[PDB]
Structure formats: C-alpha cells, structure tokens
Amino acid sequence: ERGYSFSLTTFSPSGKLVQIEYALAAVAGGAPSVGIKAANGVVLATEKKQKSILYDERSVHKVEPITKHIGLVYSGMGPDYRVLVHRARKLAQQYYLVYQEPIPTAQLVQRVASVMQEYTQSGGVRPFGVSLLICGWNEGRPYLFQSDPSGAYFAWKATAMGKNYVNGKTFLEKRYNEDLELEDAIHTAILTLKESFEGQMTEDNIEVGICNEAGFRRLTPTEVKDYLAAIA
Amino acid sequence: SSAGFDRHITIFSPEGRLYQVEYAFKAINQGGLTSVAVRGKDCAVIVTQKKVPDKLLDSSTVTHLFKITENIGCVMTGMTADSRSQVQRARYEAANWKYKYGYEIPVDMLCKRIADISQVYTQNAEMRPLGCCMILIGIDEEQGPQVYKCDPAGYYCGFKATAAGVKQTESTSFLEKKVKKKFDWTFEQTVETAITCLSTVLSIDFKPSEIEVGVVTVENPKFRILTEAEIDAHLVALAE
Amino acid sequence: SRRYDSRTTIFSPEGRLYQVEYAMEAIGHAGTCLGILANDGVLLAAERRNIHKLLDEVFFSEKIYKLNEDMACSVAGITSDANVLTNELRLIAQRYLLQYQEPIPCEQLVTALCDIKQAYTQFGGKRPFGVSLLYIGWDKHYGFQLYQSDPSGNYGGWKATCIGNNSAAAVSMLKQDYKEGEMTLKSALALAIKVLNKTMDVSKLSAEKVEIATLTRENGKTVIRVLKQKEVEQLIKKHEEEEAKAEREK
Amino acid sequence: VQVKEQSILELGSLLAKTGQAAELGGLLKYVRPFLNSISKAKAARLVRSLLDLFLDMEAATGQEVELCLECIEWAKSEKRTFLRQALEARLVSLYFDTKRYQEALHLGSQLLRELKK
Amino acid sequence: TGYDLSASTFSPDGRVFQVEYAMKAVENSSTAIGIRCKDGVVFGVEKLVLSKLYEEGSNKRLFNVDRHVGMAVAGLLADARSLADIAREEASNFRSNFGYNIPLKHLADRVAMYVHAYTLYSAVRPFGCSFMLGSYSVNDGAQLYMIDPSGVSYGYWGCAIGKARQAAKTEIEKLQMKEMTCRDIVKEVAKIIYIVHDEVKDKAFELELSWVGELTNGRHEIVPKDIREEAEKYAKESLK
C-alpha cells in the first residue's frame, strides 16, 4: 500500500505549532511522577492505581531498565511508552556492538530525542504523547534528563511531572538542596508524592527506582512497605 | 471542543483527546453479546452465550471460541470479520515464535505482540482501528493459570475475573462482590460462579443448548471445549 | 486524501508564500543573539532563556556549537531543528575534508546548508525548518568572516548583526555607533555589553543570564574560547562605573 | 534473621505491658552492635518503635536522658536529618518534665532556625 | 455530516456507513436460492429478460469455481466476475502447493479474508456482491456456505438472497429438507420460485438450475434440459 506523504503539523498565522501544544495538554493529564538526585544516586518515584481489585498489580511495570545502569519512567499516554522503550533498547544494542562499551547516558538521550523530533515532521503521522525521565550513573557523577514531545531536552536537579506539576516544583524548591543521601531523597520523594496521592498509600500503589554506582534496579514491595512505614 | 479534522481521523483534539479510537469502544457493543472469564486455584474457565434466531441456519458453525494453540485458548467480541482476522494473525505469530526460538510461547508475550501490532492503527491517519476485543487463557509453568485481555486501543492487561460485552459494568460489580469474600476456589466452584454470574446478570434460567464453555486445568493442559452432556451435568448439579 | 491535505508548497494570489513568512514570525520571539567583528577575533553574544533555579549546567555550552576546527555557530528558534541542522552540516564539512585534505572555506559550507534548507520550499509538501542562525570563522582566503542564514534560504555577509526579538533596536544602535577597521578585541566587548543592556528589560545584567564566545587567531591554533563567569562581572561593573561617570559629566 | 527482629519487637511489647523499664534499657543496649547488619529502613523503624515504647511509660530517673542523647548521636552518625530533628523535639519536650531551666531553652532556640528553613 | 464519505471513519455512534450502502446496493438484485439435500445441494436462479434482442444463455449468474465447487452470485456483475476469478486462482494455487482438492472450510475462509481486506483503507471501495458456495464430497457430505460483502461467511441448511429473500425463506422453512434425496427437490425449487415476483413487476423471466452431489460422482454441472422441462411443467400447477 502507501501512506499520505504530507505533514499533519503546520505553522499557524501566529507562528506556533498547534499539534505540539495539544500533545503537551494530553501529557499534563497523566499520572504524577517525581525525580531527585543527591550526590550519590538518583531516585525515580511514580504512582500507579488499578481501577478495582480485579486487576493484577504485579503483571505490568512502570519503571523499565534499558540496560544495567539506565532507568526510565514516563508520564502521559500508555501504549506509546512501549514503542519508545523498544527503540531505546535497540539503540543501546547497536552502540554496544560498535564500540564494545556501555552507552553513555547523554548519547542515548540525544538519540531518543532525535527519533521523537523526527516523528513530528514526516507525513501522515501524529506526534507521541508522553514525557520521559531518564536516569543513569556513569563515571561517578549521576545524571538526570527529561525529554519532550517536541524533541527538546533539559538537565535537572529535581523535577516533577504529570498532574499538579507546578505544586511539585514549588514544593521541591523549598526542600531540595545539593547534599543529601539516597535514603533522605527517598523520604522526600514519598513526602512530595503524598501531596496529590490517594487517601491511604499502600506498598503496591507506588513504584520506586534507585540508581547508584552499583547499578539500576527496581525496589521490591517489601522494602517499599518498610520505607512507607516510619514516615509520614 | 473540536477544531478541524479531529473528528474524522486520529489526531489530538484541543483538550488532548482523540475520538476516532473511543468510537471503537462503543462499536464493540454492536454484537449484543457478553462473555465472562474466571481464574481459579488450578484452572481457568471461559463462558459465553450463543443465539441462533433461525432454524435454517446451521448451529454447528456459530462458535466464538477458537483454538489458538494446543495450550492457549481465546474468545472474541464485536465485529466478526475483524475478530477472525485477529485470530489469523495470532495463529501465525505463535507458529513463528515456535519456529524461531525452539520452545513454546508464553501467553503474555503473545498478548504484547498483538497489542503492539494493533497500536499502529491509532498512529497513522489512513487506517481504521479494528473494533474487536480479545480474551486469552493459558497455563504457564511455575505460574499456573493466566487470563489476559486486549483492547483496540493497544492496552493489554492481566486479570483475575473479566467480562466483555454489553453488560460489562454490573457483571464486574457482581464478580468483585463475590471475590471480596476470599473463599477457596476449586473447579466446580469456579464453573458454578462463572455460570451464575451470567445467569443473574441476564436473568434467563437457560438450557444446555444456549451457552458455550471452555476450560483449562493442570491435569491435561490441552484446551478443550465441554460437550453438551457434561454441560447439562454441571447445570443440573448447580440447581440442588 | 486530497481533502485532508494542507498544500504547504503552492503560491498565493499576492505573490508571496505563507509558510516561510509564518516561520519568520515564529523566529521573532525566543531568544536574542548578536555578532560583531572588527579586528583579530570575532565575538558572539547570546541571551540565555532557561534560567530556572534547578538546572544542572552540563555540556559546557548552552547555545554555542562547534562545527569544525575553526567554525562556530549560534542558533535561534526551535531547538530540535537546530540539533538536526548542526548534525547535518557537521558531516558536510567532514566529507569535504575527506575529499580534498584541506579545511573547508566558510562560504561553501554556508551555501551548501542553505541549498538543503531551500530544497523544502519548492517540492515535497513538508513543513519547513523554522531556524535562523549565525556563522563565525576564519580561513586563509579572506581572514575572519561572519554570516547569517534564513529559513527562506538566502544569506549574506555582515559586519555586525542581531537576530533576537528586539533585533530592530540592536541594529539601529549598532549602525549609530561603529567604526570600520579600528575596533580591537577590547572595545567590541564593551559595545556588546551596552547593546545587551539596552535590549533586555532586566537591568544590572546578571552574569548568569548572558553568554559570550570569542574566536582569536594563533600561529597554528585558531583557539576558540568560552570565557567563564569569573570575568564577566568586572566587565559589567566597569561598564556601570564608566556610564555613571559619563552621565555625571552631563 | 528477620525472625530475630520480630521476636525482639514482641518481647519489647510484652516487657512494656508488664510494667518495668530496666529490662527495656538492657534490650536497647543489647542490639546496638547488631543493628549495623540489616537494612536502614528496618533499623530506623526498630529504633523508633523501641524509643516511643520506652518513653511513653513512667519516669525512671536513671534512664530517661542518656538514651535520647545516644539516639541523637547515632542519628547524627547515620546522617538522617528528619530522624534527628524529631528526636530533638522529643528530647526538648522531655527536659521540661524533669524541671530543667536552661537545657530546655537553648535547644529550642537552636532548633527554631533549622525548622524555619 | 461527512462521516459517510470514507471507509475509514467511524460515525459518532460507532459504525461504518459505506458498507451499509453496499448492502443497500445488493438488495436490488433479482433473487437466488440454494438448499442442501441428503446427498448434495441444489441452486436456483431466476433471470429476468430485459428485451427480446438478447440471446438465451447470456450472462450466466451460475458460475463454476472448481472441478467440484460451484458458486451463485447476486449484485453487480463485474465485481462478481472478479471474485470468481480470484477464487479460481486461489483454488488452483492450493491444489498445486499441497496436492489434493481444497475443502470448503478453507476456500470459503480465504475468499472471505480477501473480501474483508477492502473495508479498512480509504484508497479502495468495498465490494458489492453477495454469493453462495456449494459442494459435495464422499468423505465430507454436502457443504453450503454464504458470504456477504461486509466479509461474513456462515453455513446454512438453506438460504436466499436478493429482493424477496425473506418471502422465499418463509416457504423454504416449511419444507422438511432434512430427509429426502435431491431428486425431487428440483420440483419444489421450481415451485418456490414461481410463487414470487408477481407478473405485475415484470413480464417474463427464465430459470437457471445447477446440480452437484453423489448423483454426479462429484462433478458439478447444469441440469439436463428434459429434467428442467418436467420441473417447470410441475411448477406451473400453482395457479390452482
């Protein structure tokens, strides 16, 4: 068959791209998320909620490992997340085949952003509807990055995304600093996620990921319950 | 709420939504049929209704149950042709996995591959996103029974009790009320609950010739369809 | 299929074509950049936009990009297309060097990129590139050089230019105060500081809100330096004190 | 391993129910070297679950001051700001019930500046 | 409006409109019935004579798909001929690949999938023919299937398509076709077509009858002339 071969994203009379704005508006309605780094590693926290008790909470995951030391979380549309995850895995594989070394974080961020940008200029397609957070630990210094449906990216110390992201950023403004440890970072991440959380926070509604110079991994529900207790 | 061609193809509306996909969800209800799936301690049951309005039609070829693989079974709802096409794609994909990797395919990988295939239709602006649903049941080593569901928007998940069709909401409510009690589950209990759910949602008190049942269990993982006689046996055993 | 098309290539009854015009209206906002040269060394000044309290400040460069051993360029507009274009011209320069074993002159590289940029405005039916950017460089043919691009496709050499939102005021002030063949790499910095002071609304010129890059010539080095934040502050305060003294004179 | 900590908690609860404090202080002294062998979350929760049960009973003159000070020291060693701040608040509240003049004043003034930020 | 111009736009209530328009295009065809006996099937078509200039035997609507499979069409002739050609090529391909005559349950499915492939995209239009496939085999008995332009195929004991489909099936159901051999079925088919399409609607017409079953040793062909003569002679007695 064939496609259409004409761009669906065009310039308005006021010099603005409408579709990117609508994609950002769709992103703003997703599940909230928070990300922090303090001098030793990075913490990614996200909130998950099944509609009823029928759903199995251990069947799918939000935090996904690209490789041994890169982590990624999302906010926005659901199905579009897997395509980006799969593409990132492929890209890391070609990099490792060519150079025989684990990929640096910045290169992976740049390549993923390039794909996401290219997806808004071709013909007969519509842009993605997610916003990503990427974390890693290479050569000692930890790294945190955030993407954008338009393809741009930034580097952050602490970031909040999803619903009520403005309140999260203001809250992090008066709390975060440049010298803490991973445990206190976890404490403040749960504290700031409690701002818009549900009535009762259980050990299964929350997913937490930690990166240190030992590798990326996803916290099991037991220690998540341990952290939820003795706090708040 | 709309501006331009957002009502005719799959692009974002100003509020951040897209309607060409949520129209398919209500296109599902055109068939007017309901199916239920229940998972037990060591077995899984799929039950559905069938309606034959005319005597001239041959009743032996109206089944909605399909044998995807000797160990994996499925049930469909919605438009018939789309469901048949999805069945064809699933069969081909399972056979290809067996050819390539040399061992049987897990059910979750199959569901993920199907959902990833379906997600493209809601990305490009020249196709229509196939208004038909998907329910699969299977047995996995070290896990036991598994029940998964897939939808036209590309969202797959794993459930413990599912209903798809016209009466989805109240059937899920009844199943939740039953499952909150946290009682032991065996084969007969699971089948009885699955049948009574549909019986009380529709309020029919039907006969052994108007439903279909499929079952899988850890004694012969082959997917099998119950014959009318043993279906009548369960039906009479249910009524004391 | 022809119902959903937007026809992003046809003309208009009045003679002009709209998409490039709308792109030029888009480049109007979002940033301020300028470039000046009069003797050994040429300088680029940029106005940083992302100035939030939580930025990690990596990569040692915000908007200044290196294209070759002796080529640097700034950019204004949508940043993703900027990444695309910079990556696209980098291998153009490298393939020229591979074929000829000689550093590429600036003019040819600019013309090649402009040809690629113009290709999208005549056939293909795709959205054009909304990015305009500067070029600074040195080569044995004509010494030091500055150039400016355009989403339409054309270009041109210059002696002092600005691109950002308040480009009109900057251009007027530049043409009011400039001298041909005398400004060394000591007065040009002061001129740029004064121009930026006028254009931006925020006074006192916080040193973290500006970025300066200079290119100078060595025996065989052609060193590009991005002067740090430890030298901007005394430059700003010197400007402030001399301005106060001059005003007090009147 | 974890069964040991579970039993420790249950025995502490039983000793609190019985109505004595010397054994509870002995229990607190008993496990201090042990604690540097498990997760930080469990260690913190056990420290809190022992301290609260010890303090919310009745006065024993010998043991109601040094325990809080050594907990402050341990929290400072472990670098946990919230834990040490909560324990400082508890300690400054505890000084007053012993009719103390100045040690319940300078501590609060020192903590005010940190809390206000 | 405008939701009913492409084949890739769901209407707000959630259904496709172009396929419904194809249906309404079918409902103006003449008539065609087909019923299965104890050991075969029998087709029957009434063909209208527009003007005296045309010759007998023109534009037959009873097509011969394969050496043991027959087809009867209704709708637009051009699309029907295209479908006949594609089915014929597919059957020959199957015989070449595997090595024996294709069963109905596979050929009907393949043609149905090919027809359904033309209802998703906006670059092509849906077909406009509804048709019936019939066959008989010694190892599988008699087989009858019906396929509609939307892409749906079912099995029947007896079916009718065209204008007065329901009127024909009314007298179809009165018959106890489950028992008799299809040697006396020809007379009742002739009778059931002469009891429809009043002479007020049109002046003259003609009858086309097919034949397949064990009586022909598996071959499919037109009935002998004398047998049809006797059949219509019997059917004329409905004037009583």
State the main characteristics.
part of a larger assembly, 5 chains, A: about 230 residues, alpha+beta, Glutamine Phosphoribosylpyrophosphate, subunit 1, domain 1, five-stranded antiparallel β-sheet, 6 helices, 10 strands, about 30% helix, about 20% strand, globular, B: about 240 residues
Distance between the termini of chain C: 71 Å
- What sequence of helices (H) and strands (E) makes up the elements of chain C? HEEEEEHHEEEEEHHEEH
Strand order of the largest sheet of chain C: 10-1-2-11-12
Instruction: Estimate the helix proportion of chain C, in percent.
Output: 25-40%
- Looking at CATH, the homologous superfamily of chain C is Aminohydrolase, N-terminal nucleophile (Ntn) domain
| CATH homologous superfamily heading of chain A | Aminohydrolase, N-terminal nucleophile (Ntn) domain
CATH C-level class of chain C is Alpha Beta
- The assembly state of the depicted protein chains is part of a larger assembly
Tally of contiguous helical segments of chain A: 6
In which range does the helix fraction of chain A lie?
Answer: 25-40%
Largest interface: A-C, 36 and 32 residues
- Anisotropy-based shape of chain A: globular
What can be said about the biggest beta sheet of chain A? Answer: 5 strands, antiparallel
General form of chain C: globular
CATH architecture assignment name of chain A: 4-Layer Sandwich
What fraction strand of chain C? 15-25%
Order of helices and strands of chain A: HEEEEHHEEEEHHEEH
**CA gyration radius of chain C, whole angstroms:** 20 Å
CATH architectural designation of chain C:
4-Layer Sandwich
Helices, strands, pairings?
This is part of a larger assembly, with chains A (232 residues), B (240 residues), C (250 residues), D (117 residues) and E (240 residues).
Chain A: H1 18-27, E1 33-37, E2 42-47, E3 64-67, E4 70-76, H2 79-99, H3 105-118, E5 130-137, E6 142-146, E7 154-155, E8 158-161, H4 165-173, H5 182-193, E9 206-212, E10 215-218, H6 221-228
Chain C: H1 18-26, E1 33-37, E2 42-47, E3 65-68, E4 71-73, E5 76-77, H2 79-100, H3 106-119, E6 131-132, E7 134-139, E8 143-148, E9 156-157, E10 160-162, H4 167-176, H5 187-199, E11 210-215, E12 224-225, H6 232-249
Antiparallel strand pairs in C: 1-2, 1-10, 2-11, 3-4, 4-7, 5-6, 7-8, 8-9, 11-12
Chain D: H1 2-18, H2 22-30, H3 32-35, H4 40-55, H5 66-78, H6 81-96, H7 106-116
PDB class: cytosolic protein
Keywords: protein degradation, macromolecular complex, ubiquitin-proteasome system, cytosolic protein
Entry title: Cryo-EM structure of human 26S proteasomal RP subcomplex (Ea state) bound to K11/K48-branched ubiquitin (Ub) chain composed of three Ub.
